[model samples]
Target: SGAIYVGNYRVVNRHLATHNDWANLVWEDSSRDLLVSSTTAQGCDTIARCDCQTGVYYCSSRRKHYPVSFSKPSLIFVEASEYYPARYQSHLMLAVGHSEPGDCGGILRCQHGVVGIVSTGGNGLVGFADVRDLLWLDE
Candidate 1:
């Protein structure tokens, strides 16, 4: 319970990258804006589930999941390594803001893809970082 909070807004640049589990994802209420990624991310594969309200977008394996998107943090090795700048396994999908929670209590996860959320004046959460496969988001 130390990393998992995506709130605020911004991540609308359009990117790609899921897994197959259970909970998948849901949030047509809480006013979390709009979310619903199915199959969750338990093992490490692609599933599909992002309707929430009829936005349309979903693609896996080929690295393309949309229809109400924002997924990254697929999988990072090196004992869950994250350098925030260099030495990264994979990360980057910010647009979060003010997630006042503490350890994934459903603060904001945008389906699971984001590594660009700054302005940590306080809790606000959304503060992950690192390099990537092909997207120069230098620090």
Candidate 2:
């Protein structure tokens, strides 16, 4: 894992799985404390501490936070080669939505829990890698 800047935030790319798409990252404060908390496979019922202005949800008591939330899974084709030239798969698709250029490595959570991480996107649809797949890897 290594440090990278996402906008003005400093985060460490904490999990680099065998699957290129399954890489995980965590946001950290200046002191190195986690700005966002971790989640479980079986997500939560609701996010209670969201900051409407910034669209960030936090659980200060737990030192956790949620950056993005989704309800259900949606699929869209992801041209893997676009990001990682060595990897390519036509059948490889993922949930799609609005995301920015440097949005990859950002977390995608749900009331149920985190579902994926931003991988790639364009033309109004973003692609992410499934967290479940990442969980299966032995590191």
Candidate 3:
């Protein structure tokens, strides 16, 4: 697993950075995205699961600041975890295009906390990434 510069947290992206998601192992060299890895060198094909408790292996891409898009992956709600999250209380509120992200056992979680899998519109995903800490961003 890799780590990014999330305000100095050495975090992970936990997901791939697509052209739409605007995230990847190598960021725009702006030090703005989490899971700070070389998207150019690393690419976005890598995938990992965080514990959702300790928040390790959360970012599949290996960066931190570059927030990965929840919509990037196919949420089939199989009650199965293809990957574990790095945090316990993190959230994945993608309320765009998705009608029922939380329908068939929605909510991607791990041993510690859970990341909310909500359905929303536009690519806002709660106005910004999983936490919605800032304004809207479309990558």
Candidate 4:
């Protein structure tokens, strides 16, 4: 609940007495007050859309809710791929790749603590992001 609203909506974290999974809400960008909510688990996991003027919205799309998720993106650091020019180019040659033509979302930067080939439609860094530099985990 402490998470700042990105876009306008914040991920809804549900703490059900019977189970552990929950739903959340969030905004896509700061410029727009559009809000979206979704459940995280085996349930329907639907997404809700709305605005600030009227706290009302509805949707049937299935989307899982997560306790923590990326809000916008902030650049961290850029590094050369182990495969570099050669291997990197080799992979790029495979036109089968997806995402914005270049198979990348382009220079993704994350805030609130957050790599790789970003996903198309939406920005999702999926390559060589050393979690150690972006997160904290306890075991």
Which predicted model would earn the best TM-score?
Answer: 2
How large an RMSD does model 4 have?
18.0
Per-residue accuracy of model 1 over 27-120 as CA lDDT, tens digit each? 2211111222332223221122221211222222123322333334332222221212322233423223333222221212223333222211
Task: Provide the global lDDT of candidate 3 against the true structure.
Answer: 0.28
lDDT of each: 0.24, 0.35, 0.28, 0.21
Q: Every model's Cα RMSD, please? A: 15.8, 12.6, 15.3, 18.0
lDDT of 1 at 4: 25
| lDDT accuracy of residue 37 in candidate 1 | 38
lDDT of 3 by residue, 34-129 (tens): 333333232222122332222211322222222233433222221223333223222333333223222222233334333322222233222112
Give lDDT tens digits, candidate 4, residues 1-139.
1111223222211110112212343222111111234333233112222111111111112122112223222333333333222222111111111123232222222221211112222142222111212111111
Task: Kindly report which residue stretches of model 2 are placed more than 4 angstroms away from their true locations once superposed.
Answer: 1-83, 86-96, 136-139
Q: Any runs in candidate 4 off by more than 4 Å, and if so which?
A: 1-98, 103-105, 112-139
User: Considering every candidate listed, which one attains the maximal lDDT?
Assistant: 2
Cα-based lDDT at residue 75, candidate 3: 26
Better of 1 and 4 by TM-score: 1
TM-score quality measure for candidate 3:
0.21
